[PDB]
């Protein structure tokens, strides 16, 4: 069981993702953490601080 962190979502019922350690104080059994931007996951939208942790690329400004 993995946690899709961040402010938004795109994952589906077969998509291929990458996961990393770290549990959430959620219901017992969640200890993995989907990597946003790594495979089928995407960086959250209109994110502008702690961007590298959500896979969102630098806005051209």
Partner RNA sequence: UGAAGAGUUUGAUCAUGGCUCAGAUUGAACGCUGGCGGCAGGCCUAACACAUGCAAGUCGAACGGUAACAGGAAGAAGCUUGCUUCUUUGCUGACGAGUGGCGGACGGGUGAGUAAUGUCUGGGAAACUGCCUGAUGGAGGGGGAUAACUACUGGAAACGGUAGCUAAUACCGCAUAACGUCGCAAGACCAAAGAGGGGGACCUUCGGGCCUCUUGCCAUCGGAUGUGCCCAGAUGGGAUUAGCUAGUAGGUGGGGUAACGGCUCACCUAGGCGACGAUCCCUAGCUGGUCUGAGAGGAUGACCAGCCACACUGGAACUGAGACACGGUCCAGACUCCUACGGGAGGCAGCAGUGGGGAAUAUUGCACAAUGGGCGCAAGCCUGAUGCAGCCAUGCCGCGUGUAUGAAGAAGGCCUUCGGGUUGUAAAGUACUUUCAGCGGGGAGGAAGGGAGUAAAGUUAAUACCUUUGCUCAUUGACGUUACCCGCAGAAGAAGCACCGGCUAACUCCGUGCCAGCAGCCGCGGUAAUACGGAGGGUGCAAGCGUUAAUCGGAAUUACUGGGCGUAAAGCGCACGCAGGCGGUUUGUUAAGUCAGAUGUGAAAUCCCCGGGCUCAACCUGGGAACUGCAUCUGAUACUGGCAAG
Partner RNA sequence: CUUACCACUUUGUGAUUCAUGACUGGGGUGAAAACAAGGUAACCGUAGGGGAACCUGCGGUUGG
Which residues lie near RNA (CB under 7 A)?
5-9, 18, 20-26, 33, 35, 37-38, 43, 46-58
What is the Rg, in whole angstroms, of the alpha carbon atoms belonging to the chain? 12
Tell me the closest approach of the beta carbon of residue 5 to RNA, in angstroms: 3
**13 vs 49 by CB, closer to RNA:** 49
Instruction: In whole angstroms, give the CA distance from residue 12 to residue 40.
Output: 9
Locate tokens 């770290």: which residue?
22
Minimum distance, C-beta of residue 4 to RNA, in the bound complex (Å)? 8
Token pair of 37 as six digits? 């931007």
Q: What are residue 3's DSSP bridge partners?
A: 33
In angstroms, give the least distance from the CB of 3 to RNA: 8
């Amino acid at each position: 069981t993995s946690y899709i962190g961040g402010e938004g979502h795109n994952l589906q019922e077969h998509s291929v993702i990458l996961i990393r350690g770290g549990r959430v104080k959620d219901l017992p059994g969640v200890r993995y953490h989907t990597v946003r931007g790594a495979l089928d996951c995407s960086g959250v939208k209109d994110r502008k601080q702690a961007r590298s942790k959500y896979g969102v690329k630098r806005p051209k400004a």
